[PDB]
Design a protein around this ligand. Structure first.
Ligand SMILES: Nc1ncnc2c1ncn2[C@@H]1O[C@H](COP(=O)(O)OP(=O)(O)OP(=O)(O)O)[C@@H](O)[C@H]1O
Ligand SMILES: Nc1ncnc2c1ncn2[C@@H]1O[C@H](COP(=O)(O)OP(=O)(O)OP(=O)(O)O)[C@@H](O)[C@H]1O
Ligand SMILES: Nc1ncnc2c1ncn2[C@@H]1O[C@H](COP(=O)(O)OP(=O)(O)OP(=O)(O)O)[C@@H](O)[C@H]1O
Lengths: 376, 375, 372, 368, 376
């Protein structure tokens, strides 16, 4: 979808806040205190209505996706013995789903009562259910494109039957743990290893019975093109600056992924630099979701998929020459996704214009301002 | 807040009952199987709607706070050797909420259908919600006075061998936690009192270290000291004269326990004391700390300037007659602005009590009840 | 068994105390802070070894059955504003176990060292082991008579909404010693045993009615039910009106009582006094029935032992208070009672030879004396 | 203890490298793939034998404690399309172990054969065994000064008594090469220690034996001094405390703004405080026979990877000086890739890493 | 070891029992009741002192290898309301170990008290500890022969790293769950598959690269002889009556165990008859323990290992022609193992002498007698 602005009232550290988001790229910088995680959590809480209408609900018991009592402001006064909650907590998300309509959905919590949603949240989850039911039917000539809602946190490296063909499954499995705060690298390695081995098996079998090629070769073709897509995205980060390219799988290396370099050969990914692993994990996380969601594009799963992706500390483990080429490379790899990223490195801030910078300042009473730089 | 009259219809052992309360103290005197706990439960059920408007009532797990099928009167027909269930069971209560506002509200239950209430109970709930909103408001000029509601039944007893803070324990509304429930609330008092004492000692040590911070920093020390003295005075007023023990405090030497002092004896933990003193201290503390927590802007008159209704069942238990002759006066002197409704079956409590506070309960063969002043 | 004299040295509030008990009933009358629960705890600690000789004492989770450092006397030195712990704490008990056998046994604790006991304390454990061995024998011509020991403290109370498939050990005689000298409530055991009895009796009733003519077990069950019912009637009927305690399936499988004017009501819907009195009497009655099954009709009327009751007049109005001692003596004629109270109404019709006023001096010297 | 030179032959990425360390501080400044973690890992492996003689490393099964097959260099041919697995992996470390006790030790790995070392490594291991036996004596007037060895990597951010006993002394070397330092455990044990100290203070205050009191008091003093060295310069905050009055929280003091909670600070500063506090606590535990200058008078080697992790550029100009001043006897080896760290450091401690087209690495200093 | 007598007092259903065991084979027959399981459990409880001296028992902590309170005798009388518990319960076992050391140990329980043991039980545990410490050495030239204690129950078909070389491990791992009542066929198939794959890989790297023929032949010979011993033990039951023989591992059938028949070929084991599967499981369960315990024999791991084995319902799922050949084939497969087996069928009873049959009968009071038949 898309988001235009977000308003916060009586949240964790903000008494009130109004923030505006850019069309393509926006960067949040806060010199002191928290506040970046607060805004990212607010945006993450404003999109759970969509994913809830996709069989993802309290079965996993992910209690972090609803406003909690610990998320309400609690003021301490030195001259009094009591400590009173400030009620109610309110998130007002303004967005745009399909070109033409502007929506404004609100999520509020009052004290210890269960959280409450407005009519627009119900409308949004009904839209999610509508897309699910439209996908699940196969007796249609016109296919549909799903949006991508992904959240990447600072815990994305802590603890580092597969299918691809069009169906109700393998098109809704890309929403599994999309907004979770844990790592999801094992899933990528399993899926990629399965895809590579099955592609090798299919290309071996192709030489046996060419008669059914009209029904078989296309399979291989699909299982080829997808790979290319993924690889292309990864290259856009790892080749011009570092030199590594063409992520591959080979059982000859004790069945683990490898990467290629012009001069240092083919080396396992498990014993490379930290920044390369970070970039590979991020771009892989975006890409394999993009290719599972829209197998029907088969070459523009990364160049036509639309959605919203959240990143915390995008410049983690990278050197300045790399930090001067991360934003443009992310834009080139995925040109149709809106990004909300949080940084603090002065190098990254010099690769973007003044319209994509938001300085968050907080007063003593909690009032917050999301300003833009004065000079240019 | 005040309650003035009460009516019961087909509630337990009473086919019909009308009872009138006094402004300050009312004592119900009757033998076993007369209906005192019945009246106390009726008052609890009448007053619950006010508490239902607060966020502290969402954790109540007491099943006795709604009218039940076991509460419907059963009539024994001897010829058929049968018991017939009479319906409906109804409660009516007249009272005053704010200045110059009289009201009457009703509760009912028929058969096995869920209980029902009229509009006035909903208005109590809305009044409670309004007060809760007023308390939680920042930058308020006028002050807010919260009332006190408590029920001290037979589950308050401290028998042999019967016995960090959450962010909600520091709120005013925490004075309404388990207020009208049939449970024991000594652990909450213990935790809060220990926290006050630890904070006060921390400030004392800090002041003793550097004598250069006694400017705008000593307000919190003063507030805590005043809360401590209020609770201590309230507890002393019941025990000191007849028993000698006073000054309930917190001691780290005695394995971090609550201790009390005697002139002839020494200083002993509360859990090692007599049953009567132990129960009396628990009973008085249950009111004192709630009074301190609810209204923090009085700061030394929380016990002496709080209004509300407090219910006590079997007030003279574990106390010898010499102690029984002083309890009503001690409670009236400690908490002078609280309407007390108490029940007893001992002539010693009524030793020095006016005849305008005693209600004898009588019943006829058909179940018609009477609550009358003594002649 | 029987206890005749007791001595306390450096216990909680007594530097020294010597107390003599009566054969049948003895009442301790004193205000608060006088040492009645102190004497009851002393007697409980003295009597523990006999139970410690039984296999039913392995599941005891009570920390109050051993002398603790909190029981050592503390002397307040005013000049130094100090508390001094005086040692040692001793408990001496004189009594009789079997015919023509007088004994005296002592318990001690010094400092923070573990408590100690003498040889005469171990002989009680050995006698308990011997009795247990004689109860678990097949083809024994001689009968075995077991004594009853019970403690009914302040933890027995049935307050508002307390609401406290049998194991194979619940059918043994020795199960009469489960949590006997512990500060706990034992109402669930009585409820389960009584419900099982009533269900079995009804099963036999329908079985007999189906095919008119096995005949002995029905008689045993009927006799046990009659004994328990009579024991409760001896206290509840005359003053209040509720007599028969029965199991009812029509009332959602609950225990019910009946009244001449009112109807039939569950026990958990009655007054506090009724609940407490019924629990107190039943706790003795069903243990009497279980311990000695060979009497079969006089288990309550022919059982010997010691029963300790604290605050016997709780939740009872003066008219009921005037008759508790007589009711207990009429229900259980052969049991030695030691009870504590501070009400002048319980002593209304009691001989002066059963009253022990407790007093103490400024130095802690205690006296338990007859009135006048 | 001190390391003076490291030499590597046929390592992960270096065909031959010779680096000279400094007495106090050294920074390896290089972009990605230039071999900064490799140097730290080599130093870490060189120090394994000393720890190995403590009967505590046999429980954990970690493959990184010895050279593996993945360590051996691989050469690319570009014509045969094959990777040549070179051999042997060589590690040479020279230094001082005591007052005028110089030594030079070596670790080797040939092919798939298990790694083996010279008997000077056994000499170091038996020196460690001698130390652990000597400290275990229950009656000895002589004072033993144990050193500090710690490795804080990029995995550090994710998951009882202070008596003069052998268990307390040997608890310092627990997980000394796989240390973790986040905020949760730090606040937990700091709060426990402060609660015990406040209990003893209140006991003394109420009624006017001291063995366990002074230890806690001066451990508090040491930790407070270290954190103050970290924070009191740039900001006025100092004297981290646990306040039960202030909603039972860890609070800091500022002469103008009063008291502020520690939960209002950013994650980076909290993690830096936790790192400094953990190092100071290990220093206090290891050498109790000073009780207040343990952090200021203990020698050893501490290895930190990516010291500029999650730090605002304003706090990247004071980390090195703060670490130097809070521990003026420890030898530090840290790896950075940010110029803001180097804005106040002298030239002598900077070791830029270069590598030719073959793998002939160099560790040099800026020319000026 | 060996057992020559067993006495039971106040156990589950026997008030008093005295039973004598034969040197090689003994059969227990009971027309009614559950005495056979009682006697087998008594024998199983009298051998746990030996196994308790091995640390490998730490893997199992079931509360079933000690005398429970439910194992005592409860007396129900129809004329009384009380039900009492007969105490004490005693298991007296008379046996021989060390080939000449006669002993008589006793286990007892008194009511709810914890179980008690005599000096001889401690001696047996100490002898187990001595054997463990003597095995844990490696440089010693003289080799130790361990005994086997195995129990097979009726639940041995329900539930349906690796090393072999001489060491402290792989010689004590054969005692893992030796007296448990849960099936352990998975832990046999895993070990057998590992052994077969390793042997095949050694053979492949042998003939493919003759230069690596220096000293790897000894491992190949040891593994070959282990396979041969297991196969012969299984053949001694299967071949003569059913025709199947020479079980094999082959990945050509989806990595599954296979068996061979001259007139039907090679078939996966999971699809044969029930009786053949039962026999394979039993003989495998004996065999791989016999070969892991004593690799040093390396030719007669089955023909020279001594011990005691208990079988419940030995004739399960077998037809009458197979029930006249089970006892003799068990004896031939393992000639030096004492067997205590329980059965019903009259066909098995005709293949053994009159001196190896025990008939258990109970009186009304519980007194038990173990008679011998008069006829043939
Ligand atoms: N559902 C019912 N229908 C009719 N009578 C009932 C019912 N439930 C209880 N009763 C009777 O009503 C009386 C209840 O009296 P209650 O115990 O409340 O008063 P009390 O004697 O003053 O006791 P307390 O000490 O608890 O105040 C008892 O006689 C009881 O048997
Ligand atoms: N360890 C101790 N040292 C000194 N004095 C103690 C100690 N423990 C308790 N005391 C005091 O001695 C008193 C003993 O009286 P106790 O409460 O046992 O009897 P009682 O007043 O008759 O109570 P009850 O209602 O239980 O019969 C305690 O109330 C307390 O004041
Ligand atoms: N086994 C190996 N054989 C050959 N080259 C290797 C091997 N393992 C790693 N490398 C190469 O060595 C380099 C790894 O450098 P290193 O791991 O020291 O990282 P770094 O750039 O110093 O940063 P960081 O501290 O973040 O890890 C990469 O160029 C990698 O391709």
């Amino acid at each position: 979808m898309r988001i235009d602005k977000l308003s916060l009232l009586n949240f964790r550290c903000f008494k009130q806040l109004d923030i505006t988001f850019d069309e393509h790229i926006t960067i949040l910088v806060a010199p002191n205190g928290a506040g970046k995680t607060t805004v990212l959590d607010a945006v993450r809480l404003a999109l759970f209505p969509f994913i809830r209408g996709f069989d993802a609900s309290l079965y996993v018991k992910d209690k972090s996706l609803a406003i909690r009592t610990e998320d309400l402001r609690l003021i301490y006064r030195q001259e009094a013995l009591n400590m009173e909650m400030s009620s109610p907590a309110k998130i007002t998300a303004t967005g745009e789903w399909a070109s033409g309509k502007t929506a404004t959905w609100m999520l509020d919590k009052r004290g210890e009562q269960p959280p409450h949603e407005d009519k627009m949240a119900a409308q949004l989850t009904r839209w999610g259910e509508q897309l699910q039911k439209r996908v699940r039917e196969e007796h249609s000539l016109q296919q549909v494109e799903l949006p991508l809602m992904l959240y990447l946190g600072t815990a994305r490296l802590w603890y580092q039957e597969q299918r691809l063909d069009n169906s109700a499954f393998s098109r809704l499995s890309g929403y599994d743990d999309c907004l979770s705060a844990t790592s999801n690298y094992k899933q990528f390695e399993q899926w990629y290893s399965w895809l590579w081995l099955s592609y090798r098996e299919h290309q071996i079998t192709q030489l046996e019975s060419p008669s059914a090629k009209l029904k078989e070769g296309v399979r291989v073709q699909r299982m080829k093109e997808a790979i290319q897509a993924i690889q292309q995205a990864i290259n856009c980060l790892t080749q011009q600056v570092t030199g590594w390219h063409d992520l591959e799988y080979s059982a000859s290396h004790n069945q683990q992924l490898v990467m290629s370099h012009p001069q240092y050969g083919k080396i396992p990914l498990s014993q490379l630099s930290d920044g390369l692993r970070n970039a590979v994990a991020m771009v892989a996380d975006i890409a394999f979701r993009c290719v599972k969601l829209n197998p029907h594009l088969q070459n523009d799963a990364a160049l036509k998929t639309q959605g919203i992706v959240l990143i915390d500390e995008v410049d983690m483990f990278l050197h300045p020459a790399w930090q001067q080429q991360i934003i443009q490379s992310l834009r080139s790899a995925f040109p149709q996704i809106q990004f909300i990223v949080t940084t603090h490195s002065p190098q990254v801030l010099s690769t973007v214009k003044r319209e994509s910078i938001r300085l968050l300042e907080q007063d003593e009473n909690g009032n917050g301002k999301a300003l833009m730089p004065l000079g240019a």
